Structure formats: C-alpha cells, structure tokens
C-alpha cells in the first residue's frame, strides 16, 4: 500500500536531489538546522510507530529564507491537523531560530490538489516536487519545466467528479516523468504503479 521510505530515497537520488537531501522521516523531523544551504526532506504525517500514513515534502531556500511545504492534496495546516493529527509549528520554530537572523521565515505552501482522493501516489508526487525544488528553488510550486507538467486544481474541489480526469492525467504524467529520470522507477515500475494506483484506497 503506497511508497516505502527506501523506494522514495532511491527516486530522490535518481532525480539529482541527493547532495541537498536530508532523508525520509516521520512527523518528528527536526527541521533545517545544520546550515543555511539549499535543503529538502520527505516527511510522514504520522510517527514511525503507526507504520506511516501520508507523505509530505519540505524545502529550504536560503536566498529568500523560505520553507516550502508540499502536500500533493494542497490541504491547509488546519486541515492537515484535523485529518492527519499533523502539525509542524515546532519545526518552523527550530528552523527560523537556527537559520534566520531576524528570527522570521516565509512559509510557502500549495492551495491545490494534483492527486486524486483515492490515490496512493503521495510519496511519488513528493519526489517530483523535490525535482522541481532542487532545479528551481526560487519558483518551485509552478512556472518551471517540472511543475508545468501537472495541473493543480483548488483543494476544496478534491472529492468532485469534474476534476477526476485532470487528476488522473496528472498521475499518468507523474509516471512518464519518473520513468524518464529514474532507473529505480523503471526497474520496479509494475510493482510501484500497482501499489500507488489512482483508485488504490477503494481496493485495499
């Protein structure tokens, strides 16, 4: 069911993220503390003990002092906390205190879903956003060669029939992009595609 941490680590490396990548973590990810460099991570909403629930991506741009938070579903912090019991305030505090001079950071996050409500490809869309992040850390959410391939639709429209074909096309293009840049993906493709299926939650 979905993507394992090993699977995502291998894809992130294949996409040219490796030098900037902090690894895969559960909800207790510390933040960007080591130094004021270009950095990223893949974080789970739940703690390791649950076995994992939802995958998120975090980026740090030192040039603007911005923490990018990517949720494929584009939920709000209030909605991430309601649904997933996930909050990352302490993380933004530890980071702003350790890296910014004015003790302030900018928090940039998506308002739009790229993923279908039943899909198990959250880990994989996270790999894709991190490819867009490491090549264009100034404009990563949209307006770059990687994120331009996907169609973001308002989050409030997530469980509506009118957007299903847009979100399915996004899932088809997610695989085409990954097959193009990742040998790990190509070699494990049938197992990955099946386990991260657009309609996977309906087939548990």
């Amino acid at each position: 069911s979905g993507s394992s941490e090993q699977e995502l680590a291998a894809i992130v490396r294949d996409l040219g993220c490796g030098p900037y990548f902090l690894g895969t973590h559960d909800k207790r990810f510390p933040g960007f503390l080591a130094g004021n460099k270009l950095a990223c991570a893949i974080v789970n909403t739940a703690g390791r003990e649950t076995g994992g629930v939802h995958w998120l991506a975090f980026g740090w741009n030192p040039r603007s002092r911005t923490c990018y938070m990517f949720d494929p579903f584009g939920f709000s912090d209030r909605r991430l906390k309601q649904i997933y019991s996930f909050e990352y305030e302490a993380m933004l505090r530890r980071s702003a205190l350790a890296l910014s001079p004015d003790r302030c950071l900018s928090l940039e996050q998506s308002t739009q879903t790229v993923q279908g409500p039943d899909s198990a490809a959250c880990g994989l869309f996270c790999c894709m956003f991190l490819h867009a992040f490491v090549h264009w850390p100034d404009r990563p959410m949209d307006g770059n060669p990687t994120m331009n391939l996907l169609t973001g639709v308002p989050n409030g429209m997530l469980q509506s029939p009118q957007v299903l074909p847009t979100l399915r096309r996004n899932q088809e293009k997610l695989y085409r992009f990954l097959a193009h840049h990742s040998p790990y993906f190509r070699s494990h493709r049938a197992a990955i595609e099946h386990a991260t299926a657009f309609d996977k939650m309906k087939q548990l």
């Binding site: 584009g74 933004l92 505090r93 003790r103 950071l105 928090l107 940039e108 959410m141 308002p154």
Partner: peptide
C-alpha cells in the same frame, strides 16, 4: 503547477 500562499512567521 499549483497555486500557493506565502505567510511570514516570526518566533
């Protein structure tokens, strides 16, 4: 890509 919201957080 996706539309986004940018917020300033001070600690």
């Amino acid at each position: 890509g996706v539309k986004s919201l940018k917020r300033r957080r001070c600690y």
